[PDB]
Amino acid sequence: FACKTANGTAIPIGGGSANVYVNLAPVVNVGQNLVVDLSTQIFCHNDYPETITDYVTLQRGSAYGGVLSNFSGTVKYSGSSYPFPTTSETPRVVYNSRTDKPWPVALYLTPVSSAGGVAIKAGSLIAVLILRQTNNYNSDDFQFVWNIYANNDVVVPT
Ligand SMILES: CCCCCCCO[C@H]1O[C@H](CO)[C@@H](O)[C@H](O)[C@@H]1F
């Protein structure tokens, strides 16, 4: 089991960490969602599907900078919605193929009432998402740490 970003940055067998640079809607109104779709950014595969079933969860998701201060979040994992920052590990997503499959993570961020102006700064850390991988074969328990950075400023109109 290993993962890669849309740009080619890979995390090999055993896990580790990588940076994900995301373009964000430049203008988000109060009452609207800022959608951060990581399913188009992070792709994973099973290296031995003939024998092994890989189990994948979002172990935890943390918010930073402008996202923590200015937004109310929800994380959608494989069609199910949960609070973001996270309060529990999600159910497992099965990886049973050698073909790259998107990691089904999407953040839904709505501005808080106090938000106004530059709510997210360009180049800032916005989230850290922990992909946890296990299997039905051995004691392997690996963490694929995804550091999410904003490519641009996000303005919340006043
Ligand atoms: C003849 C025995 C061959 C042993 C195959 C081990 C390959 O391990 C890697 O890929 C696995 C499948 O994706 C992961 O379950 C595992 O945790 C690790 F990432």
From Swiss-Prot:
It is found in: Fimbrium. The keyword Signal applies. GO terms for biological process: cell adhesion; cell adhesion involved in single-species biofilm formation; cell-substrate adhesion; mechanosensory behavior. Keywords: Fimbrium, Signal. GO terms for cellular component: host cell membrane; pilus; pilus tip. One of its GO terms (molecular function) is D-mannose binding. Belongs to the fimbrial protein family. Involved in regulation of length and mediation of adhesion of type 1 fimbriae (but not necessary for the production of fimbriae). Adhesin responsible for the binding to D-mannose. It is laterally positioned at intervals in the structure of the type 1 fimbriae. In order to integrate FimH in the fimbriae FimF and FimG are needed. This is Type 1 fimbrin D-mannose specific adhesin. It comes from Escherichia coli (strain K12). The gene is fimH.
